[model samples]
Target: MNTRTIYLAGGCFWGLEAYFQRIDGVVDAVSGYANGNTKNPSYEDVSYRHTGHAETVKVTYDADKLSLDDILQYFFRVVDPTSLNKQGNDTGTQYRSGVYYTDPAEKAVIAAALKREQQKYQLPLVVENEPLKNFYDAEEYHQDYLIKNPNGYSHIDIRKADEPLP
Candidate 1:
């Protein structure tokens, strides 16, 4: 199977994880911490707002079934790209928006996507595009969190694409 991974942070990972799980190409989604200086930050540490880590979901997908660009498009729809350090009620750096790319070749595609997205709003994009940093898997309870806790709180409002981003 031709597989690839992408890490994204857009507010609480619960909603992001659930949304991506519904997408066609995504094989798995795990909520975790990314781009932090702390070594193995805990939910408490990150949630308390000092670890500098964003609550991100690492998605593994079948490339044959879905293109990376398609995944990025879906990601943009699920969160407000213009928002900084928050999404809906959740507020903090951990709840911020970001995209962590694994492949060097993916850089240009991601940059172009961000530029296209930037035109949609007057506000500056807070979504950071960076190389994959230290990713610490969240506690077991946070893994597939929405699956275990079906009634969990979610701040995301997944939108339908009106016009495809080039």
Candidate 2:
């Protein structure tokens, strides 16, 4: 299968993962820590120990069905590109927004998306666009967190996925 993956750190992984999973072309969305200095850092390490990790979602999508551009467009819809080190009520670097890609070519694509997004906002967009340094799977409990805990808190409205992008 031809699949492409992107790491997105919008806010809480719980909401970001849940939102991406609802998109039609997304094959899977898993919660994780990305671009952190520590190896296999735990949730506590990220939240308290200052591991410098962003709570990210590993979104895998069928390349044939979803272009990377489309994926990023969906991401922009739910995430506040202008916010720095914050999304919703969540604060700290762990909740910072970023896009981490493995393929070098994707950098330009990401940049283009951000450029397009920049036009919509008055403030400077602070969303990070960088090469994925590393990613570690979050604990088992964090996976599909919204699915297991439907009433849980989410910065984004997952129903937005059902709406057509303007």
Candidate 3:
């Protein structure tokens, strides 16, 4: 009814589910593999049998037109969250950067939006505000992969969801 799923994991679920399926109260955005440790994993078993899965993105928004701190500020504006496993060029640990939650009171609303996105970053953000210990469903050619490969391979900048949030 009042949809609100959230399981982002930054780098490469085909450009983070094609940048939250082009935003605006996003109603679905699948491409997944979250909270890993092997189960139904196969994107070459989380990229060559590591299975520490994390290329997630199960978004499903529209809690009265996006809240959850405005969808965690569009998930910290297309992720980087102080790069650990890495984003833009996709590194290991499944390109790690996370925010898996299943609403345990939204974990203090994702720790107050990661403390206001770490007061605009000065390192120390590493994103992973965990909770959702599972999510699988990635296949069928990485669902909607940049709208079926419209010259895919994104590091997100899907025009920054046409810019919002001041």
Candidate 4:
């Protein structure tokens, strides 16, 4: 099936992945790193090396089932766009909020949504909008972390009852 990809970073990806996976049209949300200075930066590298990567989730979704604007609406609801380089308890470059798109054509689409997002906030929304530079899948253990450890900790808490598993 045809699908579009968008990488998002908003605090801990565990909840981000779980939250998006439960959405109407999302195929899956894979925990990963994006827009990093280094190639294939490891979680350790991001946590320690300060590789400038945001802890991101590559969300694959069917556009027919969900519009990009609708998806962005859901995303904005879950994150604080005004905050810079921080979300919830997580503090670091990796936890920063951003939207990364692979297709150049999506730039205008994202910017329009961002404008609407900005209107909701009194302060400037800090979410970085840029073409995806690179994305690397996190270690296998990091994938579906919320599903494997039902008791897993996430900065952005997600009630499993409200969200169906992928």
**Colliding residue pairs in candidate 1:** none
TM-score, candidate number 4: 0.92
Q: After superposition, how far is residue 116 of candidate 4 from its true place, in Å?
A: 1.0
Per-residue lDDT tens digits for candidate 4, residues 39-77, read 998889999998988999998999788777777877887
Which 10 residues in a row give candidate 1 its minimum summed lDDT?
A: 157-166
For residue 5, give model 1's deviation from the true position in Å: 0.3
Model 1 Cα lDDT, one tens digit per residue, 8-35: 9989998898888877678899899999
Ranking by TM-score: 2, 4, 1, 3
For TM-score, candidate 2 versus 4, the one ahead is: 2
- What lDDT score goes with residue 97 in model 1? 91
Candidate 2: regions farther than 4 A off: none
Give the per-residue Cα lDDT of candidate 3 at 71: 76
What's the CA error at residue 51 for candidate 4, in Å? 1.4
- Which runs in model 4 stand beyond 4 Å of their true positions? 159-166
**CA error at residue 93 for candidate 4, angstroms:** 0.9
- Find the candidate with the highest lDDT and give its number: 2
TM-score per model over all chains: 0.91, 0.98, 0.32, 0.92
| RMSD (Å) per prediction | 2.5, 0.8, 14.8, 3.0
Off by over 4 Å in 1: 158-166
